[PDB]
């Protein structure tokens with residue numbers, strides 16, 4: 001069958017991937033007792049946009065649910081799926097003649113059918129007529145709440161939909177649940193995105209020099225990913241935090257735009273991940289700017305390396321993800337105690353939630369078409385109201401096929417440290433004279449992408465991780 | 479005063495630039511009979527956004543009117559200007575403590591006042607209270623229609639604005655008219671954006687090899703602009719058209735994403751421009767993929783080069799822009815005839831609008847903070863209802879301070895050529911035995927950025943343009 005491909009050494013992605021997703025979705029819906037026979041899934045693709053009221057086009061990136069089901073790259077489409085038969089129909093815009101001048105070839109419906117390997121293709125302006133001829137019982141549309149953004153996903157609409165029976169409650173939980181579990185074809189793409197991004201991280205580590213601006217490495221990373229990987233988009237805005245900026249978790253946005261000069265003695269925390277055909281990667285590398293870990297830097301870094309490997313070593317089906325978060329917490333506290341930053345009973349530290357002072361984010365999250373993938377908190381899965389754990393993007397138990405990030409970290413964040421020092425229940429553990437040396441240190445995060453298997457996990461990421469590996473890589477000439 | 483700067487060799491842009499814009503706006507408004515004392519201009523900045531319903535942040539780029547007035551890079555702000563005094567107040571978001579953990583330092587209001595050199599800084603939630611205490615006559619908000627996109631620019635709104643007297647008709651044409659004329663400080667930035675983008679185009683010409691994907695050069699261009707120029711954004715999606723794709727004017731979008739393999743014999747048309755601190759550049763270079771112009775390629779290319787230089791040579795204050803478009807049309811028709819593609823009376827060809835078959839777009843457009851800058855069609859200025867000319871983004875007369883693109887091109891577009899061949903009023907001019915050789919040629923566009931001056935123009939762009947210059951550049955080796 002046909003495949004998406006950007007030539008050279010880029011990955012060929014079979015369109016069968018999306019056909020399988022459609023089949024899996026139909027299979028799940030059929031088993032839902034509330035789903036009537038003759039139901040049709042109706043999805044609306046993303047539309048082209050411009051900057052504000054200007055004529056400046058924004059580069060189109062497909063809506064995630066629509067991509068998952070159809071893999072369509074063109075704006076302005078709809079896509080439907082007959083639940084009972086699994087038959088798929090793509091609706092494409094009927095373009096004006098002038099499109100041939102300004103935008104490119106006006107492809108036939110048959111072209112799109114062959115390109116996407118769907119059962120039928122029609123024009124968007126005929127959707128009401130086509131659906132009417134099928135005489136559906138009900139249209140299943142997509143509406144629900146994303147548990148990371150809090151945004152409501154807006155359901156499909158077209159002129160004449162009001163004359164149909166529409167249900168907007170059933171579909172969202174079901175398609176979300178399908179996305180949580182990656183097919184072998186999906187895993188092939190995620191292996192690829194990790195491969196390219198890992199390569200790019202390596203090039204960045206080799207390229208870093210004292211005196212460079214953070215954004216120079218952002219630029220290099222994205223250039224490697226695009227030119228060598230065909231990754232026109234990143235999965236998220238590159239986080240290139242040097243020195244104290246490595247303590248800022250999502251540094252790099254417009255308000256803090258990777259504009260610090262890298263200095264001798266800085267730690268770097270680079271969290272960057274290219275996107276290929278709307279599939280994510282999410283990788284963080286931490287390393288000394290000058291290529292040589294100091295004693296303090298080595299201690300903090302190896303603490304996180306320890307929690308990283310411990311979590312990965314423990315992960316397998318049935319494991320409760322919050323237990324992994326607490327494992328990482330305990331390890332960090334043990335190591336910070338060994339360093340002399342902390343003193344006392346680690347058990348008591350844990351009881352006082354001291355771990356969250358140093359890791360004020362969740363251990364990791366589902367990853368897929370989105371960097372923070374859907375399905376972390378389905379109905380019946382509750383968020384844990386404790387420091388650190390409340391920032392977990394899922395509280396589920398691990399099952400085979402899930403793709404998760406493993407991203408423990410340790411940071412020295414002033415307002416969190418100050419809060420702890422003011423609290424008698426936590427201050428007693430902190431050795432102020434030692435901690436003072438680590439003010440402005442920033443932080444370390446080690447972030448891997450992994451897949452849950454029947455017996456454990458598969459690691460997708462491949463970057464240098466031990467102190468020796470990192471120093472060797474950075475000293476590389478070629 | 480303070481300056482915007484991304485270090486290394488990037489441009490220091492004084493915040494005085496935006497102070498001058500605010501002053502100029504006020505000075506214009508004070509002369510407007512519709513403006514009464516005690517008026518306050520109220521602008522709303524862009525807000526941060528995400529992809530669809532996801533948690534994936536979109537990199538924030540400031541709204542253009544707000545940038546012109548304040549130069550603010552942070553999302554979620556408002557800005558007001560007291561017309562009578564010119565006093566400026568920036569409103570910044572009141573951030574949650576957790577911002578310190580995830581996004582970074584929670585800067586003080588004083589930090590922002592010092593950063594942007596405004597007269598006062600307040601929190602956004604206080605805007606109603608602060609404006610109330612000032613006892614304005616009327617709030618002047620921004621609403622109008624962009625004549626390129628057709629979009630309505632939405633006016634500022636805040637909780638309690640309904641308690642105020644609001645006018646949304648006065649401001650838009652006035653701020654637009656200020657934007658049309660670039661200050662010396664603004665020109666410094668556009669010189670810079672052209673410098674970096676020109677350097678990047680040159681690096682691309684040196685690097686292009688047969689067998690590469692078009693997007694490899696897109697990537698390289700943007701990497702040069704960001705890493706060397708501090709240009710995090712491009713001014714528009716890169717157009718990297720090779721072979722027949724060079725006939726597609728805005729090739730490179732999601733539907734045609736620069737994904738063709740460059741072949742020996744192809745012409746390349748690369749239209750790319752980095753953006754620095756929300757100021758545009760807009761440059762097109764055309765060249766043979768293999769670094770050697772064929773005879774046919776040289777002829778088409780030099781035809782566009784002739785019209786480019788003719789227009790640039792003719793441009794000066796008082797010139798009517800549509801006349802420059804017609805000048806380009808005439809030169810293209812002359813040269814296509816000199817090539818044997820066309821035969822007959824060139825005067826007759828012009829009367830039949832034959833030029834539009836080969837250049838089905840406007841000669842050029844205003845440029846500034848937006849690549850297609852505002853103000854091309856103010857009240858009174860009409861769009862000419864003829865092929866080609868109707869696509870002009872302005873029909874104004876040239877005056878000093880205007881910044882325009884000069885981007886003639888010649889393309890071989892099948893459905894337009896076929897229309898002409900089926901039209902008795904046009905068909906006889908076309909020599910099929912020669913034209914057939916140029917089917918699938920693609921096209922050539924030569925795009926420069928210029929400033930209208932008292933004496934003519936200032937050319938901002940600095941790339942190789944003659945056949946000799948281009949072949950040298952591609953060989954790794956010019957005078958504008």
Ligand SMILES: CC(C)C[C@H](N)C(=O)O
Pocket residue numbers: 055056057714715728749750760849850885
């Ligand atoms: C918005 C972009 C497609 C503009 C294009 N670079 C031009 O010459 O007008």
Ligand SMILES: CC(C)C[C@H](N)C(=O)O
Pocket residue numbers: 236237250271272282371372405407447533534535
């Ligand atoms: C910036 C965020 C959207 C994603 C971030 N890279 C993470 O590890 O979660």
Ligand code: PRO
Pocket residue numbers: 249250361362364365393407
């Ligand atoms: O957003 C998240 O969940 C991870 C943890 C901190 C960095 N990114």
Ligand code: PRO
Pocket residue numbers: 727728839840842843871885
């Ligand atoms: O859109 C415009 O006006 C110019 C002319 C063709 C290429 N871009």
Ligand SMILES: [Mn+2]
Pocket residue numbers: 271272282283284447
């Ligand atoms: Mn990450």
Ligand SMILES: [Mn+2]
Pocket residue numbers: 282365405407447
């Ligand atoms: Mn992550």
Ligand SMILES: [Mn+2]
Pocket residue numbers: 760843883885925
């Ligand atoms: Mn242009």
Ligand SMILES: [Mn+2]
Pocket residue numbers: 749750760761762925
């Ligand atoms: Mn252009």
